[PDB]
Design a binder for this molecule. Structure first.
Ligand SMILES: CC(=O)N[C@@H]1[C@@H](O)[C@H](O[C@@H]2O[C@H](CO)[C@H](O)[C@H](O)[C@H]2O)[C@@H](CO)O[C@H]1O
Ligand SMILES: CC(=O)N[C@H]1[C@H]([C@H](O)[C@H](O)CO)O[C@@](O)(C(=O)O)C[C@@H]1O
Length: 362
């Protein structure tokens, strides 16, 4: 499989790459992103976000640095953990978390992480160039309904979606100070003005939920989320654009994630030729446990045939992940094609999985 980002051979001399992202464009252009982890695999390090772009259905690629850290600290400055979406105008939005100090975003501080923010760039040229960074949290002009007890938040890590009427929804995660503890929860944010401003939904029902993606289904949002230490991906449904949540039984508990901490995964909607809406999820089986995150697999559910059990479609990365940082992945579906990007021993690899879609599409 093609090595999209190569720790061993890359224009930045980066030691390591993590947290890949993909969007298949309407015109067959492929756009991908990744954390450039200059010094190695650690989260709390010097990081920028790369793009790789391909006009030849992924034979060859053009690479750029799509977002730079705030350059304040040469050890700890980082923008990372990309969430993306393509608007109905075809604008491409990337939202990242920004820090410059040591220590986990959610758990290190008991008040608002002083160096923390959420930075956003957008592209109006099919991803050839990006705007300047736009700071979503410096003031209260850009995001409404942000809780006073916020420690930090960032996107869900993967892709957002667009509702019928053109509202953009991005998956998100937040850390909140609640009775002398820090608790993290998944939620969504939405923009009704092509990404210029945003409203924050409210948190899902269980804490310990973080990275996630939502699909739209007949006006509902359905979320598949990392639920740390539970051993599975949680799932919830919202009928009011993310103000309230209930447990979504068809998917809740259905994808197992093995012992230890959870792992990022992706969750996207496809409509097959027979009219059925299907969901596809990517995540490691993690049979070896903890951060090994072996066997990044693709699973499928049919929303129009709920009694049929979730099925493993294929295992694009049938290998143990690197314990220092692996397992993450991202699907993208557009115009009857299906691609995936994913971590593989410090590299990002890329595959076209369209043949698997054909098998499903029958
Ligand atoms: C459990 C342990 O011995 N050390 C942990 C960290 O590994 C863990 O952090 C996670 O580490 C993985 C490594 O593959 C990856 O870097 C994750 O992004 C990161 O969150 C942390 C969990 O809070 O606990 C430390 O003690
Ligand atoms: C630190 C951060 O913001 N992002 C990192 C998250 C969080 O550390 C955990 O969710 C705990 O909060 O986990 C990691 C992982 O699991 O491989 C990679 C990712 O870059």
């Amino acid at each position: 499989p093609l090595i999209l980002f190569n720790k061993d051979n890359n224009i930045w001399n980066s030691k390591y790459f993590r947290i890949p992202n993909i969007q298949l464009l309407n015109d067959g252009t492929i756009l991908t992103f990744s954390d450039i982890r200059y010094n190695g695999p650690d989260n709390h390090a010097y990081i920028d976000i790369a793009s790789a772009r391909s006009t030849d259905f992924g034979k060859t690629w053009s690479y750029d640095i799509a977002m730079k850290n705030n350059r304040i600290d040469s050890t700890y400055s980082r923008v990372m953990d990309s969430t993306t979406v393509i608007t109905n105008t075809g604008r491409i939005i990337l939202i990242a978390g920004s820090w410059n100090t040591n220590g986990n975003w959610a758990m290190t501080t008991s008040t608002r992480r002083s160096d923390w923010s959420v930075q956003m760039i957008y592209s109006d040229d099919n991803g050839l160039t990006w705007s300047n960074k736009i700071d979503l949290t410096k003031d209260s002009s850009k995001v409404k309904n942000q809780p006073s007890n916020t420690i930090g938040w960032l996107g869900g890590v993967g892709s957002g979606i667009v509702m019928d009427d053109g509202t953009i929804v991005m998956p998100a995660q937040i850390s909140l100070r609640e009775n002398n503890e820090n608790n993290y929860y998944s939620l969504i944010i939405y923009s009704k003005d092509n990404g210029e401003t945003w409203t924050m939904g409210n948190k899902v029902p269980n804490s310990n939920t973080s990275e996630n993606m939502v699909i739209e289904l007949d006006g509902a949002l359905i979320m598949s989320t990392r639920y740390d230490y539970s051993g599975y991906r949680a799932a919830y449904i919202s009928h009011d654009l993310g103000s309230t949540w209930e447990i979504y039984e068809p998917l809740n508990g259905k994808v197992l994630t093995g012992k230890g901490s959870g792992c990022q995964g992706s969750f996207i909607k496809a409509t097959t030729s027979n009219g059925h809406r299907i969901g596809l999820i990517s995540a490691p089986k993690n049979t070896k446990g903890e951060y090994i995150r072996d066997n990044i697999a693709v699973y499928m559910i049919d929303f129009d045939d709920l009694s049929k059990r979730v099925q493993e479609i294929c295992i694009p990365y049938p290998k143990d992940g690197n314990k220092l940082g692996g397992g993450y992945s991202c699907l993208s579906f557009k115009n009857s094609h299906l691609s995936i990007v994913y971590e593989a021993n410090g590299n990002i690899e890329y595959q076209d999985l369209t043949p698997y879609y054909s098998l499903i599409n029958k």
